[PDB]
Amino acid sequence: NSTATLCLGHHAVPNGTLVKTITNDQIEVTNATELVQSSSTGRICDSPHRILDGKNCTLVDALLGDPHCDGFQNEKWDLFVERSKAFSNCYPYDVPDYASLRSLVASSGTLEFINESFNWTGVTQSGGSYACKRGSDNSFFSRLNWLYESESKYPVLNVTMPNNGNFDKLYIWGVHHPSTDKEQTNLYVRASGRVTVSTKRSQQTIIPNIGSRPWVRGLSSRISIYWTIVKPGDILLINSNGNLIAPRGYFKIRTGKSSIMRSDAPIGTCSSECITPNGSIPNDKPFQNVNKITYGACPKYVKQNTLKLATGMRNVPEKAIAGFIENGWEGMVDGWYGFRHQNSEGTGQAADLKSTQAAIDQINGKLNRVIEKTNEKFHQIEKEFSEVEGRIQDLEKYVEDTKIDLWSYNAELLVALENQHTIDLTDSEMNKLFEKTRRQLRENAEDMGNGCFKIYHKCDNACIGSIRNGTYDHDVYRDEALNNRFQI
Amino acid sequence: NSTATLCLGHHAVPNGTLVKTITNDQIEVTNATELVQSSSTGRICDSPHRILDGKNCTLVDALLGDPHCDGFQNEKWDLFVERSKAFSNCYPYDVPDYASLRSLVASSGTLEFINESFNWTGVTQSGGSYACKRGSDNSFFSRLNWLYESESKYPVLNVTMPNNGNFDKLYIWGVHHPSTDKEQTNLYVRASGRVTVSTKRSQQTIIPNIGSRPWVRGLSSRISIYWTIVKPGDILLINSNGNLIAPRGYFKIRTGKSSIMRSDAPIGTCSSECITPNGSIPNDKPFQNVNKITYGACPKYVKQNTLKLATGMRNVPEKAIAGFIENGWEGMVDGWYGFRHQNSEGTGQAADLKSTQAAIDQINGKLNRVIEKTNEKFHQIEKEFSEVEGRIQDLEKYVEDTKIDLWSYNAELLVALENQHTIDLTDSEMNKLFEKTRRQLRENAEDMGNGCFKIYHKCDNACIGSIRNGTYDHDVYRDEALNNRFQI
Amino acid sequence: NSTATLCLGHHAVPNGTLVKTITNDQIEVTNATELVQSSSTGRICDSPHRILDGKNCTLVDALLGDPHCDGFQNEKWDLFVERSKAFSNCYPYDVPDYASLRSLVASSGTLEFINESFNWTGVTQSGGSYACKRGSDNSFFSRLNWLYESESKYPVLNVTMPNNGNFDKLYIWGVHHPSTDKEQTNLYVRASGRVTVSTKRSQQTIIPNIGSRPWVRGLSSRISIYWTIVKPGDILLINSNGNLIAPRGYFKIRTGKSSIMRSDAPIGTCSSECITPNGSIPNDKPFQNVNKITYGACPKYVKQNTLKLATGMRNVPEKAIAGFIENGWEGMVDGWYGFRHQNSEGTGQAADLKSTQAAIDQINGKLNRVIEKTNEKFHQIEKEFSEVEGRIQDLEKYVEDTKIDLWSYNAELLVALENQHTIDLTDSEMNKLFEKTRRQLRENAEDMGNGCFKIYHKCDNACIGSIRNGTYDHDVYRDEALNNRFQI
Numbered sequence A, B, C: 001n002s003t004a005t006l007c008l009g010h011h012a013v014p015n016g017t018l019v020k021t022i023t024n025d026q027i028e029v030t031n032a033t034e035l036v037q038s039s040s041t042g043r044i045c046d047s048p049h050r051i052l053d054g055k056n057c058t059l060v061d062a063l064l065g066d067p068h069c070d071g072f073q074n075e076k077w078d079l080f081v082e083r084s085k086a087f088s089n090c091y092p093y094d095v096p097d098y099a100s101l102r103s104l105v106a107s108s109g110t111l112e113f114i115n116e117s118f119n120w121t122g123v124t125q126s127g128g129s130y131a132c133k134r135g136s137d138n139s140f141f142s143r144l145n146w147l148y149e150s151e152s153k154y155p156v157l158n159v160t161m162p163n164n165g166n167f168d169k170l171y172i173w174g175v176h177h178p179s180t181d182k183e184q185t186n187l188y189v190r191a192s193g194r195v196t197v198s199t200k201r202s203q204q205t206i207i208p209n210i211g212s213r214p215w216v217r218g219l220s221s222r223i224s225i226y227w228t229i230v231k232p233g234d235i236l237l238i239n240s241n242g243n244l245i246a247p248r249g250y251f252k253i254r255t256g257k258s259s260i261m262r263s264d265a266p267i268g269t270c271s272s273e274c275i276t277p278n279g280s281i282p283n284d285k286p287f288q289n290v291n292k293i294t295y296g297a298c299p300k301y302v303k304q305n306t307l308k309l310a311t312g313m314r315n316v317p318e319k320a321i322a323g324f325i326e327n328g329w330e331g332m333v334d335g336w337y338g339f340r341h342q343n344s345e346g347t348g349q350a351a352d353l354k355s356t357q358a359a360i361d362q363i364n365g366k367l368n369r370v371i372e373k374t375n376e377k378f379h380q381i382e383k384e385f386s387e388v389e390g391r392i393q394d395l396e397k398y399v400e401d402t403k404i405d406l407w408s409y410n411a412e413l414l415v416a417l418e419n420q421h422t423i424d425l426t427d428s429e430m431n432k433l434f435e436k437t438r439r440q441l442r443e444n445a446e447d448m449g450n451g452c453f454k455i456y457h458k459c460d461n462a463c464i465g466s467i468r469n470g471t472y473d474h475d476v477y478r479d480e481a482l483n484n485r486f487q488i
C-alpha cells in the first residue's frame, strides 16, 4: 500500500579545499583558513610603538655624540631602527664588546644625558680634531672630553663623583692610542700613559698602545671606548697620568620594553602591533614565516609557508532522492544538515538549524582553546651576524634553530589534530541526527541503507513537518504501518 | 500492566566543576584535579639533601677564607644557600669572571683543602692587614699567602708543584694592586710587578695596576683573584717578580649533584625532594608556578597558575522514570552507570559494576602514560641577575624564556587533549551498555528514544535482575512480546 | 535448514606485542614497529660526505703546520675527524679561545692557504727550533714566520697587506714569550717587545711575558696564537718592535656545510647520511638514542631506548562459529576483517578486502603526516667537554639538555596519541562493516548479540556471496523470512 521517503543529508560546495589530518594525507573539506602569515606591506607602522629612525646614525654613534648625529641628543624610543647606509664621521674608534654596549643601551630605551662638573684643573679640556668637524670647526664627540697638557705639564688626575641619587648612572669614557711617541709626548708629556676607572666594587686599568693603524678619515690614531655603571651610594673615581678621554656626565639607564632592529623598510603612518625587518605584519594568525626577527605581539615563527585549518566538513560531490551515505547535497544552501522527502505532494527539502549550530559552535574559536593569544616579546637575542666569531655565535644560532624546529613541530601536529577533530565532530552530528529520527519513527519505517527511511504510511507535508519538528506521534500511524510492513 | 520500562543512566553530582576540552571552552564534569603546584610552606626542608646555610658568607668568601667565614673550612653540601644579608669583611677584592668561579665551586660541592709546602725562600710570608681582622690580630684570607720583600729584596720566584695524584687540583691565587708607587716599592722593591701561573698546557700572566680606588674598609688598594686547575700528570709553575698572592695548597674538585641557590627562606626539619627559593614544594603534580629556579625532583615550571584535569564524566543534573538522553541521576551513589526500572513490583535501581570499573581504570594513572615521573635537575644556569651585562645575559634569559613558553604550550595542549578523551571514553561506556542491553532484548522490547526500553511482557524484579545479570533468555518471553507488539 | 548464520570478525595472531596508548598502560596489538634507532655498525661511512681522518693531528696543528701534519696542507672536508691519539710535536704553544678558532676553521671546511710577500727587510726570517724538527733540521710551523734580529738590530716593523679581492682573508699570527732576559735580548735586542695587528675596524695588542713555564719538548718558552679576519677593501697592518711571529699569507675562508667530530671509530667503505661518534647510523626511524652528537640527515635524539608504534589492531585470542564480540580469528590469515557462515551447503570463511584496505591505508605513512622528513644539521655546538670552565659551558649543557627533554616529551606523546588512533580506527572499520551488513538484511535477520546474524531463510553459497558483494536483494526473501521470524 501507501508509503513515503524521508532522507537525511549534509551540504556540499562546488569549490572545496584540501587539508591534512592524522588519518589522511589529503581530504577535501568545504572550507578552510590559512594559519601562517606570509606577507607584509613592507612598511614599519609608526603606531602604537614609539619608532625612532636612526637614518644616517648607529645607536652607538648617537650615544658618543658624532656631530652628524647631534639631532639624537636625549632621545627615547620603544624601537630604534638602524639603517644599512649609516656611517661614522668623527674620531676613529673601537669598542671592546661593542655588541653588549649596543644591547644594554637599546634595552634601556633612552639617551637622556645629565652633565656633571669634574674638577679638571691642571689640564686642558675639549681637544678637537679635523677628523671630527662640527660645522666648520675641529671638534669631538659631544659626550666625551679630550684632555691634554696645560703649560707643558700633565699632572696625575685623581677625581671623584658620588652617586647621591636613587638611580644607576652609566658613564662612557675612553683611552687615546697615539700613532707616534712625538704625538704621545706632545699631548701627555710622559712617554707612557694609564687610565684607571673604579668604584667600590669594580676597577678597570687600560694602558694605551703607541703605533700606526690604517688611515681612517685622515688619522692613524684611535680611541677605545669603555663603560662603568655606578650604583646609588657608590662613587666613581677616575685616576690617570695621561691619555684619558673623560666623560662629561652620565646617561640615565632605565629598564623597560625598548629594543633595536636592523631594517631598511620605510616608516609609515598606520598602527600594527608586530614589527619585522620586512615591515609590520598582522597578528590575526597564530604563525608566521616572514622573519624570525620580531618585535611586539607577534605570531610565532615557523618553517612552513602554509598551514590550512579545516573550518567545515568533508566535501562530497552530489551523485528518487538519496541521503548522506552516497553524497553531499549541493542544493542545500541554508544549512549544513537537513531533510529531503518524496510524498504524494511532491518533493521537498528543509534545513536542520540545531544540528547546524552545534557543528558551527564547536568549530568557532577552536584554535584559541590551545593558543589563546600572541605573546609580546621585546628585547631578545641577535639572529643575523656580519662577522665570523666562533663559540658564542655558534650557541646563539643553535638556540634559535632549536626553538624554530620545536615550534614548527607544534604547528604541524596541532593542525593535523584539530583537522581530524573537525572531520570527526561534523560526521558525528550527521549520525546523531539520523539516529534521533530513527528512534522517533519506532515501527513505522525501515532504514533503506542509503541515509533514507521508507515510511510505511501516507505522510503528507504536515506529517513530514512533524517529524522534522520532533512532534511526530508514532501511535497515530502504527496500525497502518504494521499492516503495510508485515503483509505476505 | 502487561509491559515494563527499563532505563539506562549515569550518575551526576550537585557540586560539579568546569574544565576545558578541544571541543568546549567550558564544560562541567563530576570531578577534577589540579595539575599546577602554586603554593609553598615557605621553609627549605633539611632532608633528603644536605643543605649548608651560608649565613653571613658568600661561597667565594668561604672559599678564600675571610675570617668571619672560618667555620666553613673543609665543608661540603648538596645545596649551598646564599643569603642576601651576606657581607665581605677582609681585604677588598674582585674576581674576573666571578660567576664562573662561584659556579664551578658550587657544582664541585666541597671546600676540602690540602696544604702544600711551596718553597718561598727569599721573601717574607703571611702579610696581614687591619682591614682583615681575625680575632684581635691583623690577618688575611686563610687560604692565601701574602708574600713581600725580605731584607729589602724581592728575588724572582720560580716554584713548581707536580700533580702526582688521581684527581684534579684547584688552585686559587691572586695579584695585589697597590694604590701608590711608594706602596709598590716598599713591598716589592721593583716599580712594577708581574705574575705568571702556568701548566704544561695553559698559562695566565697578570700585570698589576697601581692607582687610587675608593676606600673600602680603610683601603684604596685591591686584590684580583684567579684560578688554575691542574690535571694528573701536569705541573703547576708559579713565576713572579712582585705582587703575587700565593696559594697555600689546593682544593679537591669533584663531580656530582651539588649546586647553589639564593634564598632567604628558613631551613626546617622536614623532607622534600624539590627546593625553590620560596621554600620546598610538593612534587605530586606535574607542573608548578612557584619559581623557575629549582633544585631536585621538581614539577616543570609553567606560566599558568591553574590547570584542571577532568577525573569524571560530564555532569548533567537530574531534572515516570527516564534515562541518560535526558539527564544524569544524582540519586545513584554506588556506581557511575546503572539501571532503573518500573514494573508490576513498582520501581527500583541498581549500578553496573563492570562499566563503572572500565571507566575508572582508564582514568586512573592517565597523565603518567605521557609524563611518567618528574625529572631530577641539579646545577643549571642562573635565572635572576643583579647587574646589567649585555650579550651573555641576554642569551641566558632568552634560553629560559624559550623553554618556559614551550612547556607552558605543552601543558595547555595536554590538558585539553586528555579532558576531551575523558569525556569521550565515559560517553562511550554509557553507549556500549545501552547497546549491549538492546541486543539482549531481541524482539521483546522497543527503544523509547530517551535512554529507556519498553519491554512488551510482564517482567518482575527477578526478570529485571536477569537482564542486569546478563542471563535473560529472550525465547522464554518472545511469544508473549510479539503478541503485545504486533497484535498478531 | 531453513535458516543460516553469518558472523562478522577480525583477525588475531598467536604472537602479539605490547604498546601504550592514551587509555591503556599496555595493550596487545597484532603488529608494531620500533621508532628509536639504538644500534650502529661502529664504522664511519665514507659516502656521501667527504670525510678527512686527522689521524695523529688535531685540526689546529694541521692549520699551523706542525711538521708531522705537513700532509694536510691545503686539504678540505665535509667532516674532519679528530682522534684521541693525536699529539703535538713542534714549538709548545697555547691559543686563547682555542675552541672558537677550532670552530670557525672546522665550519669553513678548508685549509687552502695563499702565500703573500710581506716586507720584512730589516730582520731575519724563518727562525727554527730543535723542538720542531722537519727531517733532520731545526724548523718551525710551516705557516708561521719566526722573525728576529739582523746584524744585532731589530727595527720597528710597520708593514701592510691590502685585501684587494672579493673574499675574506683569515690570518693566523703569534707572540713569542721567552723564558729569560738573555733569550729576549739575544733575539729581539729590546728588553720587552710588543705586537699590534690592526685593520680599519679592529686592533689587537699583545705584550709578551718573560718567565719559565714547565718544560715541554725541551723548552720552557711558549708561543701564543691569535687571528684576524680582513674584509674586502680593508687592509692588514702589522706593527712590532719584537717577539712577532708573522703570518706567511692567509687561509681562504668559506661558508657551507662542513664540521668537525671527535671519534675513534674506523672509516669504512659504505654510505650513510647520518654520522655519530659511535659510527654511522640508519635514518629510517624518526628518533635515536645512539648519541646526542650527530652530523647530517639524522633522527632526533631522545632519552627513551625504545618506543613501539602499533601497526595493527588490538590482538584478541580466539576463544560452532562466533563473531567479533567474543574474540579474534587466528585462522583468518588472508585479510584483517571477514565473514564466517553456516548455511545449507556447509561452513566457510572469506576475507573482506575493502575494509582491510581502508584500515591499512590509514595506518600506512601515519607518522610521516606529522614528521615528514629528517632534518639535516651540520656544524652545531659542542656537547662534551674535557675541562672545567663555568658560565659558558653551564649554558651550552643546559641548552642541549632542554632540547632533549622537549623532544623526548614530543616522542612520548606522539606515540601514545597515534597508538590510540590506530586502535580506534581499526575498531571503527569492524563496526562499520557490521552495520553495513545489518542494513542490507532489512527484516530478514536478527542480531544474535555475539557479532553474528541469524538469517531467517535458506541462504546457499551464492546467496551468502551476494551479501559479501553488496548485491543482496532483501525483497526476494522477505516473505519467507517474515513467516519464519513471526509465529506463536
Ligand SMILES: *[C@@H]1O[C@H](CO)[C@@H](O[C@@H]2O[C@H](CO)[C@@H](O[C@@H]3O[C@H](CO)[C@@H](O)[C@H](O)[C@@H]3O)[C@H](O)[C@H]2NC(C)=O)[C@H](O)[C@H]1NC(C)=O
Binding pocket: A180, A212, A213, A214, A215, A220, C158, C159, C160, C235
Ligand atoms: C706605517 O705604514 C703605514 C702604511 O704603510 C703608513 O700609513 C700611511 O701614511 C701615509 C702618509 O701618512 C698615508 O698617505 C696619505 O694617503 C691619503 C689618502 O690616499 C692622502 O690624502 C695623503 O696626502 C697621503 O698620501 C697612507 O694613506 C697611510 N697608509 C695606511 C695604510 O694607513 C704609516 O704612516 C707608517 N707609520 C710610520 C710611523 O712610519
Ligand SMILES: *[C@@H]1O[C@H](CO)[C@@H](O[C@@H]2O[C@H](CO)[C@@H](O[C@@H]3O[C@H](CO)[C@@H](O)[C@H](O)[C@@H]3O)[C@H](O)[C@H]2NC(C)=O)[C@H](O)[C@H]1NC(C)=O
Binding pocket: A158, A159, A160, A235, B180, B212, B213, B214, B215, B220
Ligand atoms: C685620590 O682621591 C680620593 C678621593 O678624594 C682620595 O680618597 C680619600 O682619601 C682620604 C684619606 O686621604 C679618605 O679620608 C678618610 O675618611 C675617613 C672617614 O670615612 C676618615 O676617618 C679618615 O680619617 C679620612 O678622613 C677618604 O675616605 C678617601 N675617599 C675616597 C672616595 O676614597 C685619595 O686619597 C686620593 N689619593 C691620592 C694618592 O692622592
Ligand SMILES: *[C@@H]1O[C@H](CO)[C@@H](O[C@@H]2O[C@H](CO)[C@@H](O[C@@H]3O[C@H](CO)[C@@H](O)[C@H](O)[C@@H]3O)[C@H](O)[C@H]2NC(C)=O)[C@H](O)[C@H]1NC(C)=O
Binding pocket: C119, C121, C122
Ligand atoms: C720595504 O721596506 C724597506 C725598509 O723600510 C724599504 O726600504 C727603504 O726604502 C727607502 C725608500 O726607498 C730608502 O730610503 C732611501 O735611502 C737612500 C740612502 O739609504 C736615500 O738616498 C734615498 O734618498 C731614500 O732616502 C731606505 O734606504 C730603504 N731602507 C733599506 C734598509 O733598504 C722599502 O722601500 C720597502 N719596500 C716597498 C715596496 O715599499
Ligand SMILES: *[C@@H]1O[C@H](CO)[C@@H](O[C@@H]2O[C@H](CO)[C@@H](O[C@@H]3O[C@H](CO)[C@@H](O)[C@H](O)[C@@H]3O)[C@H](O)[C@H]2NC(C)=O)[C@H](O)[C@H]1NC(C)=O
Binding pocket: B158, B159, B160, B235, C180, C212, C213, C214, C215, C220
Ligand atoms: C724554574 O723552575 C723550573 C722548575 O724546576 C726549572 O725547570 C727545570 O729546568 C731543568 C733544567 O733547565 C730541567 O731539567 C731537564 O729535565 C729533563 C726531563 O727529564 C731532562 O731530560 C734534562 O736533561 C734536564 O735535566 C727540568 O725538566 C725543568 N723542569 C720543569 C718542570 O720545567 C727552570 O729551570 C727554572 N727556571 C730558571 C730560570 O732557573
Ligand SMILES: *[C@@H]1O[C@H](CO)[C@@H](O[C@@H]2O[C@H](CO)[C@@H](O)[C@H](O)[C@H]2NC(C)=O)[C@H](O)[C@H]1NC(C)=O
Binding pocket: A031, A032, A033, A311
Ligand atoms: C569559511 O571559513 C572562514 C573562517 O572561519 C569563515 O570566515 C569567518 O567568518 C566569521 C563570520 O563571518 C568571522 O567572524 C571570522 O572572522 C571569519 N574568519 C576569517 C578567517 O575570515 C567563512 O565565513 C567561512 N565561509 C562560509 C561560506 O561559511
Ligand SMILES: *[C@@H]1O[C@H](CO)[C@@H](O[C@@H]2O[C@H](CO)[C@@H](O)[C@H](O)[C@H]2NC(C)=O)[C@H](O)[C@H]1NC(C)=O
Binding pocket: A055, A056
Ligand atoms: C644622510 O647622509 C647623506 C650623506 O652625507 C646625506 O646626503 C648628502 O646631503 C648633503 C646635504 O643635503 C648633500 O649636499 C649631498 O649631495 C648628499 N649626498 C648624497 C650622496 O646624497 C643625507 O642628506 C643624509 N640624510 C639625512 C636624513 O640626514
Ligand SMILES: *[C@@H]1O[C@H](CO)[C@@H](O[C@@H]2O[C@H](CO)[C@@H](O)[C@H](O)[C@H]2NC(C)=O)[C@H](O)[C@H]1NC(C)=O
Binding pocket: A038, A039, A040, A277, A278, A289, A290, A291, A384
Ligand atoms: C623578509 O626579509 C628576509 C631577510 O632578508 C628575506 O629572507 C631572505 O630571502 C632571500 C630571497 O628570498 C634569501 O636569498 C635570503 O637568504 C633570505 N635571508 C634570510 C636571513 O633568511 C625574506 O624572504 C623576506 N620575506 C618577505 C615575506 O618579504
Ligand SMILES: *[C@@H]1O[C@H](CO)[C@@H](O[C@@H]2O[C@H](CO)[C@@H](O)[C@H](O)[C@H]2NC(C)=O)[C@H](O)[C@H]1NC(C)=O
Binding pocket: B031, B032, B033, B311
Ligand atoms: C576525584 O578525583 C580525585 C583525583 O583522581 C580522586 O582522588 C584520588 O583518590 C584515590 C582514593 O581515595 C587516591 O588513591 C588517589 O591518590 C587520589 N588522587 C588524587 C590526585 O588525589 C578522588 O577520589 C575523586 N573523588 C570522587 C568523589 O570520586
Ligand SMILES: *[C@@H]1O[C@H](CO)[C@@H](O[C@@H]2O[C@H](CO)[C@@H](O)[C@H](O)[C@H]2NC(C)=O)[C@H](O)[C@H]1NC(C)=O
Binding pocket: B038, B039, B040, B277, B278, B290, B291, B384
Ligand atoms: C616566589 O618568589 C618569587 C621571587 O620573589 C615571587 O615572584 C615575585 O612576585 C612578586 C609579587 O607578585 C613580584 O612583584 C615580583 O616581580 C616577582 N619576582 C620575580 C623574579 O618573578 C613569587 O611570587 C613567589 N611565589 C610564592 C608562591 O611565594
Ligand SMILES: *[C@@H]1O[C@H](CO)[C@@H](O[C@@H]2O[C@H](CO)[C@@H](O)[C@H](O)[C@H]2NC(C)=O)[C@H](O)[C@H]1NC(C)=O
Binding pocket: C031, C032, C033, C311
Ligand atoms: C608489521 O608492520 C611492519 C611495519 O609497518 C610492516 O613492515 C613494512 O612492510 C612493508 C611491506 O612489506 C614495507 O614496505 C615496509 O618497509 C615495512 N616497514 C618496516 C618498518 O619494516 C610489516 O609488513 C607488518 N607485518 C605483517 C605480518 O603484517
Ligand SMILES: *[C@@H]1O[C@H](CO)[C@@H](O[C@@H]2O[C@H](CO)[C@@H](O)[C@H](O)[C@H]2NC(C)=O)[C@H](O)[C@H]1NC(C)=O
Binding pocket: C038, C039, C040, C277, C278, C289, C290, C291, C384
Ligand atoms: C655511543 O658512545 C657513547 C659515548 O662513549 C656511549 O655513551 C657512554 O656509555 C657508557 C656505557 O658503558 C657510559 O659508561 C658512558 O658514561 C657514556 N658516555 C657518554 C659521553 O654518554 C654510548 O653508550 C654509545 N652507544 C652505542 C649504541 O654504541
Ligand SMILES: *[C@@H]1O[C@H](CO)[C@@H](O)[C@H](O)[C@H]1NC(C)=O
Binding pocket: A013, A015, A016, A017, A030, A031, A032
Ligand atoms: C567558494 O566560493 C564561495 C563563493 O564565492 C566563497 O564565498 C567561498 O569562500 C569559497 N570557498 C572555498 C573553500 O574556496
Ligand SMILES: *[C@@H]1O[C@H](CO)[C@@H](O)[C@H](O)[C@H]1NC(C)=O
Binding pocket: B013, B015, B016, B017, B030, B031, B032
Ligand atoms: C563534591 O562534594 C563531595 C562531598 O564531600 C566531595 O567529596 C567532592 O570531592 C566534591 N567535588 C567537587 C568537584 O566539588
Ligand SMILES: *[C@@H]1O[C@H](CO)[C@@H](O)[C@H](O)[C@H]1NC(C)=O
Binding pocket: B055, B056
Ligand atoms: C651576622 O652578622 C651580624 C652583624 O655582624 C651579627 O650580628 C650576626 O650575629 C651574624 N650572624 C651569624 C649567624 O653569624
Ligand SMILES: *[C@@H]1O[C@H](CO)[C@@H](O)[C@H](O)[C@H]1NC(C)=O
Binding pocket: B119, B121
Ligand atoms: C728551597 O730553595 C732554596 C734555594 O732557593 C734551597 O736552598 C732550599 O734548601 C730549598 N728548600 C727548603 C728551604 O726547604
Ligand SMILES: *[C@@H]1O[C@H](CO)[C@@H](O)[C@H](O)[C@H]1NC(C)=O
Binding pocket: C013, C015, C016, C017, C029, C030, C031, C032
Ligand atoms: C609474529 O610472527 C610473524 C611470523 O613469524 C612475524 O612475521 C611477525 O612480525 C610477528 N609479529 C609480532 C608482533 O611479533
